[PDB]
Paper text:
CPS1 is a complex multidomain enzyme having two separate active centers that catalyze a three-step reaction involving two highly unstable intraenzymatic intermediates and intermediate migration between both active centers. Bicarbonate is phosphorylated by one ATP molecule (ATPA) to give carboxyphosphate, which is then attacked by ammonia, yielding carbamate, which is phosphorylated by another ATP molecule (ATPB) to produce carbamoyl phosphate. The CPS1 monomer presents the previously inferred 6-globular domain architecture, with 2-domain and 4-domain respective N- and C-terminal moieties that correspond, respectively, to the small and large subunits of bacterial CPSs (these are heterodimeric, intrinsically active and NAG-independent CPSs), with an extensive interface of ~2400 Å2 between these moieties.
The crystals of the apo and the ligand-bound forms of human recombinant CPS127 (lacking the N-terminal mitochondrial targeting peptide, residues 1–37; replaced by a His-tag to facilitate purification) contained in their asymmetric units, one or two similar dimers, respectively. Although exhibiting the same overall architecture (averaged r.m.s.d., 1.3 Å for the superposition of 1285 Cα atoms), the apo and ligand-bound forms present large differences that arise from structural rearrangements in domain L4 and in both phosphorylation domains L1 and L3. The structures of the L3 domain are highly similar in the apo and ligand-bound forms (r.m.s.d., 0.83 Å for 340 residues). In contrast, in the case of the L1 domain there are ~90 residues that are disordered (and thus that are not seen) in the apo form and that become ordered when the enzyme has the ligands bound to it. These structural findings parallel the observations that ATPB binds to domain L3 irrespective of whether NAG is or is not bound2042, whereas the affinity of the enzyme for ATPA, the ATP molecule that binds in domain L1, is extremely low in the absence of NAG20. Indeed, the crystal structures account for this decreased affinity, since in the apo form, the entire B subdomain of domain L1, and loop L1β11-L1β12 (residues 654–662; called here the K-loop) could not be traced, indicating that they are mobile or disordered. All the residues of the L3 domain mediating these interactions belong to the L3β15-L3β16 loop (residues 1311–1333), named here the T′-loop (from signal transmission loop), which transitions from a β-hairpin in the apo form to a 20 Å-wide expanded loop in the ligand-bound form. In the ligand-bound form, Thr1443 interacts with NAG, while in the apo form it interacts with Leu1325 from the L3 domain.
Numbering used by the authors:
A (entry chain A): 509 to 561, 624 to 655, 660 to 778, 793 to 1130, 1139 to 1153, 1163 to 1481, 1484 to 1496
B (entry chain B): 1171 to 1481, 1484 to 1495
The structure:
């Protein structure tokens, strides 16, 4: 269960709780674990077997996944080499640049270290190896499941977690079955006849990852790059999101600094004829990888000199074998993607489906764990299932997280329970739904038009579900439809209408459903003209706020402007339609006022402060929308509500991130219902939450909040501002929203504050905040604030202790430092509300960063702050909130 | 403390609820429930609380075998719903609810009580309520005046009220302004006297800023005026009526109300026995001069929100059709 679970278990051991209740730690003992978690103890233990631990930058980084059973049998299951230079590297498996002597020396050390530490289960060990000798050292050992162990299972087909659990019961490796071959045991080392590439997904420090499989480095690598974001074509000298390189670019500087765009900079350096030796010196990337990168760029050059008549079969074959897409090829030849696909298939050049069998075909496998490659001459499976395809979400990133994994699991299960064969496609190695035991065929593959068509037509699938994997699959609806794919549920033509803003908006007009006034702008002057006619502030989509005209000027370095009303509530409608009728729905209210991004908003279900008339309008607008787009499947509509005014913000004609929350809260799986509707399986509406008979929990409320939030500085320099970003999910039930909220705070791993609160607010916000400040103080919190704000509180008879701006520490010995007060436990909550003053944006970022680094709750929204102040007033201790309550209906 | 109050008006037949309407008081629970301003349908009540209100009403109607009209009052705080009391008869809000919902609740009740059959298909039963979507209704007292507890049990100043105005609006804010105009007031646009208990300052500063940002000139007794000014909300100091002789510098409330400088008085409950007399005098002056008097904080907030949203006056009633 990750680090938190490990720490929790270790802590219970240390306090004597496990001994008192007779609970054995299964697997690696706590003594051993502690030796791997503490650097000094670790160093001591390693010295007992002549292993040791200074700068190792430029050294090769290699890791091994090792399994050791209770009888001292010990195998190495996977090895990996970092391409670049903790867990934010491009990684390949297996390692590519080692000799036998180097590989086996490290393997041997792995096994010795793992025996000496008494690992019983899985282990990860990381090495730094000197690039021109045999010198090495151990960087660290991890004796719990990690990102690496997950990557290793997905890369090899070896189910580490399952095997580790069996090992924890004292079962030796030879007595455990290899679930891929069926005929052999867990006591072996996988051989891979392919290469895997893992790349972090950065926010466009990493937010997710992709894994691709190919039988050349180049195929694997270009695939993995494409998997990161749909605007990335492959390995090219061009940036993601269609951005151009600055004119003042220091290329050597860009190469010597690790960053999210370094790979594209490398492509540029090569293309601008910088030598590979220099690139190696600056990047520390082994030259072998750079030769492969140079070969890709040479193929791009070769293709640019050709055309659809002059390009030979041989050249095209080779291009596909080193990972060129039809899209990349089309640009070089002057064709469209579709013409290029047609040209390629006319030469009968197509990819081949191969199994990941863990043994390099030494033994036949009946595994249904698959990838697709141009480097082959036959397929490894038959194509007689004609199954239903379900598209996954791709890599996690901000606004696209674990919720879509839940939706995939439910959809796949519904199909299986109806005896339908399934084909799942996804490339996210952090997902549960990529489980080859839960579907009939799993393709660990690109979610591009090209690759989905390849799979769909090769399998001759009976249909494709695009509705349960977020935005990626949904944007392919129309292209798939035009290329012979049978999309299940709501027609792709309707999806196109609903998500074309102009058409959507005209349809709302005709239906007399209100929306926020908006405009698509081209000229900067068209923006001022619009902003004039509806007042500032305004919103912007490529979501960012615009306070003034100056601020608008900077942003254009097609764009839509919308006015949100100030002080509005935001409401989400999650629903399932069938033949244009809503047969399941749930309305949730955001805690935060509308405006601050809707994708990290905390949700409450059912609604708490929405008028009954607004709810009726929400329902009515949803009824009309479902009929106007003939919906059969899941959908979502967002609304602004101010009093009785209800305005549609937008509609997503797919499942939203709140489908799991709503399903569990209402006791009805909305994805199961939707999946049934989309494949034509009849459903009994009697007990569903239709518009006419909703399901509204009476005895409890549900809250959904982000798992983790951290601050981000707009250092890019468009505007100077500090925003929050967040990821993950925690959802809880409570008797009311206040206790649900406190339970969510505890579930995220915080202690409910009870000592002191740092207050940061914009000066203009003082009148609106003084009430909540008094209320927190009356609950017994000691208040702290920067000097002017502290003086203001004290002058209004709310006691407060002054502290220093971080940038001004040591300019006044009288005033205490925030960092110190957070360390002594005097401050156990920080409120830091948005602040426009460019003078203090840096300090506010630092304050926010400090709260997060110290593991104390950070509130950055006023409504959330009010909710917290109300909740501590009502509450007590902590065990009482979860006190074996039964929640239903 | 800080609870909402909710009214359930209903008709039972053989212990089943066959018509109902839920209204929310503007005022927090505590200040007398019989001069409370009602909003229909509810504005700030959670959906779970509404379900509990409905469920408690179902049970009550069955436990007393109701056939006829009845009323139940509830305290609501978040999801906590507490019955305050039950009146097994028609309440003063039956007409309001009937005209708002388009169903005569007394007609239904009278039919039930004499055994005349009634078609429940189109009635607001618990399973299928009638909830106006396009408009909200407000019911307010026609007239309110202050009363001094001069009897000497406690020294305090209360409001009493009588009569009824009810109006429809697109939302509760416009309904409220229509009710103010219907009671014969002009919607204030010049100046506001602010009287609040000192302990209530932190909770009030937000609304004070808001009224000032709408262009109202603010007036207050000296300490309160100084407090506002120190918080950068401009305000003009005036004298306590009982202290007009102790400072010629400060202007008198009576004079400012006469010259039209003050056209709204906010005078919130105040326990300080030192100023109960003056507060009664201030309230009496507002009433005698025919200017609106707000004595509750939630009403005050509602007013401040409403003038923010609004403009003329003829436009609010502009030949709208309500159904």
């Amino acid at each position: 269960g990750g680090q938190t679970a490990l720490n929790c278990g270790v802590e219970l051991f240390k306090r004597g709780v496990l001994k008192e209740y007779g609970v054995k730690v299964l697997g690696t003992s706590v003594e051993s674990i502690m030796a791997t978690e503490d650097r000094q103890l670790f160093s001591d233990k390693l010295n007992e077997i002549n292993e040791k631990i200074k700068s190792v930058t430029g050294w090769k980084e290699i890791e091994y996944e090792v399994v050791r059973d209770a009888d001292d049998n010990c195998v190495t299951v996977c090895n990996m080499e970092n391409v670049d230079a903790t867990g934010d590297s491009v990684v390949v498996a297996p390692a590519q640049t080692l000799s036998n002597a180097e590989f086996q020396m490290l393997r041997r050390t792995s096994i010795n270290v793992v025996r000496h530490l008494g690992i019983v289960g899985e282990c990860n060990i990381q090495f730094a190896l000197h690039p021109t000798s045999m010198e090495y050292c151990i960087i660290e050992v991890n004796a719990r499941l990690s990102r690496s162990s997950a990557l290793a299972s997905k890369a090899t087909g070896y189910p580490l977690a399952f095997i580790a659990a069996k090992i924890a019961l004292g079962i030796p490796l030879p007595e455990i079955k290899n679930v891929v071959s069926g005929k052999t045991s867990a006591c072996f080392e996988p051989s891979l006849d392919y290469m895997v590439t893992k790349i972090p997904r950065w926010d466009l420090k990493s937010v997710g990852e992709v894994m691709a499989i190919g039988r050349t480095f180049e195929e694997s690598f270009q695939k993995a790059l494409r998997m990161c974001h749909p605007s990335i074509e492959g390995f090219t000298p061009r940036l993601p999101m269609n951005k151009e390189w600055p004119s003042n670019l220091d290329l050597r500087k860009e190469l010597s600094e690790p960053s999210s765009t370094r790979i594209y900079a490398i492509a540029k350096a090569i293309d601008d004829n910088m030598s590979l030796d220099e690139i190696e010196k600056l990047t520390y990337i082994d030259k072998w990888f750079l030769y492969k990168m140079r070969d890709i760029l040479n193929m791009e050059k070769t293709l640019k000199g050709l055309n659809s008549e002059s390009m030979t079969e041989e050249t095209l074959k080779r291009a596909k074998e080193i990972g060129f897409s039809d899209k990349q090829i089309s640009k070089c030849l002057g064709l469209t993607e579709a013409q290029t696909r047609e040209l390629r298939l006319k030469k009968n050049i197509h990819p081949w489906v191969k199994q990941i069998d863990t043994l390099a075909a030494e033994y036949p496998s009946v595994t249904n764990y698959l990838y697709v490659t141009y480097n082959g001459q036959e397929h490894d499976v038959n194509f007689d299932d004609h199954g239903m395809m379900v598209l996954g979400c791709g890599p996690y990133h901000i606004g696209s997280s674990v919720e879509f994994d839940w939706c995939a699991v439910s959809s796949i299960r519904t199909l299986r329970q109806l005896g339908k064969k399934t084909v799942v496609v996804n490339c996210n190695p952090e997902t549960v739904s990529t489980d080859f035991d839960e579907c009939d065929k799993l393709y660990f593959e690109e979610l591009s038009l090209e690759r989905i068509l390849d799979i769909y037509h090769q399998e001759a699938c009976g249909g494709c579900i695009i509705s349960v994997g977020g935005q990626i699959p949904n944007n392919l609806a129309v292209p798939l439809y035009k290329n012979g794919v049978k999309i299940m549920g709501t027609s792709p033509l309707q999806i196109d209408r609903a998500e074309d803003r102009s058409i959507f908006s005209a349809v709302l007009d005709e239906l007399k459903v209100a929306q926020a006034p908006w405009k698509a702008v081209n000229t900067l002057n068209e923006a001022l003209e619009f902003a004039k006619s509806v007042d500032y502030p305004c919103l912007l989509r490529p979501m960012n706020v615009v306070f003034s005209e100056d601020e608008m000027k900077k942003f254009l370095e097609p764009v839509v402007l919308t006015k949100f009303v100030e002080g509005a509530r935001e409401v989400e409608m999650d629903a399932v339609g069938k033949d244009g009728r809503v047969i399941s729905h749930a309305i949730s209210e955001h805690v935060e006022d509308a405006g601050v991004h809707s994708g990290d908003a905390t949700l409450m279900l059912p609604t708490q402060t929405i008028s009954q008339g607004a709810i009726e309008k929400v329902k009515d607008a949803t009824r009309k929308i479902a009929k106007a787009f003939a919906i059969s499947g899941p959908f979502n509509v967002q609304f602004l509500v101010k009093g009785n005014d209800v305005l549609v913000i937008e509609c997503n004609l797919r499942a939203s991130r709140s489908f799991p929350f709503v399903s569990k809260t209402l006791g009805v799986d909305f994805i199961d219902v939707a999946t049934k509707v989309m494949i034509g399986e009849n459903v009994d509406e009697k007990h569903l939450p239709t518009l006419d008979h909703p399901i509204i929990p009476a005895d409890y409320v549900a809250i959904k909040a982000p798992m983790f939030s951290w601050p981000r500085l707009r250092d890019a320099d468009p505007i100077l501002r500090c925003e929050m970003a967040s990821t993950g999910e925690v959802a809880c039930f409570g008797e009311g929203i206040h206790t649900a909220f406190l339970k969510a705070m505890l579930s995220t791993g915080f202690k409910i504050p009870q000592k002191g609160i740092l207050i940061g607010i914009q000066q203009s916000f003082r009148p609106r905040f003084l009430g909540v400040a008094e209320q927190l103080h009356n609950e017994g919190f000691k208040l702290f604030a920067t000097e002017a704000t502290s003086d203001w509180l004290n002058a209004n008879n709310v006691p407060a202790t002054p502290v220093a701006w971080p940038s001004q520490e040591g300019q006044n010995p009288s005033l205490s430092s925030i960092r110190k007060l957070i360390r002594d436990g005097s401050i156990d909550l920080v409120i830091n509300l948005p602040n426009n003053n460019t003078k203090f944006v840096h300090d506010n970022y630092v304050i926010r960063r400090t709260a997060v680094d110290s593991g104390i709750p950070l509130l950055t929204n006023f409504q959330v702050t009010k909710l917290f102040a109300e909740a501590v007033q009502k509450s007590r201790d902590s065990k009482s909130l979860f006190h074996y309550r039964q929640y239903s209906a």
